[PDB]
C-alpha cells in the first residue's frame, strides 16, 4: 500500500539538545525516545509549522518524523 512521506526536518544544534524546524501541511506523528535507561517518550500530532526543543542525552535520542526511517543522534561534550 502507498503512504505519503513528509518534508525532511531541519536541525539546529545547541548544547545537549536539538531543535527540529518542522513543516507539515497535514497532521503527522512525531515520536522521540532516548537511548538510555529512561526512554522519556514524547508523541504529538503536529499541524502546520512548529519548532520543538528536544533535549538529548549522552546515550542518544532517536526521533521518528512521519513514516521515515528513524534517525539516531548523540550529544557531545561541547561545554
Amino acid at each position: 500500500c502507498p503512504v505519503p512521506l513528509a518534508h525532511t526536518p531541519t536541525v539546529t544544534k545547541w548544547f545537549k539538545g536539538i531543535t527540529l524546524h518542522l513543516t507539515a501541511t497535514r497532521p503527522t506523528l512525531l515520536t522521540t525516545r532516548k537511548l538510555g535507561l529512561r526512554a522519556d517518550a514524547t508523541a504529538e500530532w503536529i499541524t502546520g509549522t512548529t519548532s520543538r526543543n528536544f533535549s538529548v542525552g549522552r546515550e542518544g535520542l532517536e526521533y521518528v518524523w512521519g513514516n521515515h526511517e528513524p534517525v539516531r543522534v548523540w550529544a557531545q561534550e561541547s561545554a
Binding site: 544544534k13 548523540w74 557531545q76 561541547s78
Partner: peptide, 19 residues
C-alpha cells in the same frame, strides 16, 4: 572542546570517573 554540538555517529568510548 569540540566546535560541533551533535554528530550523527555514536560515542565509541565512555568517560571514566574523574578522568
Amino acid at each position: 572542546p569540540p566546535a560541533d554540538h551533535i554528530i550523527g555517529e555514536p560515542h565509541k568510548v565512555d568517560q571514566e570517573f574523574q578522568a
